[PDB]
Design a protein around this ligand. Structure first.
Ligand SMILES: [Zn+2]
Ligand SMILES: [Zn+2]
Ligand SMILES: [Zn+2]
Ligand SMILES: [Zn+2]
Lengths: 69, 69
């Protein structure tokens, strides 16, 4: 129905919010510490020395195990 | 249709996976370090001394800013 189409779009938007903001291909699973922005996959996070959201120094990357994975 | 019901269930489960595993009311926004389990809100994470998923000693709680918040 039309409601199936509406729900597919909502699901797509929620899944896109869970994808890395740099590569757009892999799920977010890494936090830039200490700022806390959790916006990248592990491969993109390993290549950034400054946060892409707030520009703070990345002291280290913490892997996050999320229930939505 | 039955497809609409399947998608509604997927959306519900994804939304439930973003809620704190202790209070079931507030969004997850905290990571237990060093293990990385990210399953609680700030208030519930604050006094836990051991991770509720893996039993590891909690050395630090890192706040996380997720795009799904
Ligand atoms: Zn990436
Ligand atoms: Zn940041
Ligand atoms: Zn809680
Ligand atoms: Zn743990």
């Amino acid at each position: 129905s039309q409601q199936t189409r509406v729900l597919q779009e909502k699901l797509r938007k929620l899944k896109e919010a869970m994808l890395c903001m740099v590569c757009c291909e892999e799920e977010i699973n890494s936090t830039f510490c200490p700022c806390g922005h959790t916006v990248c996959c592990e491969s993109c996070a390993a290549q950034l020395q400054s946060c892409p959201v707030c520009r703070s120094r990345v002291e280290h990357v913490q892997h996050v195990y999320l229930p939505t994975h």
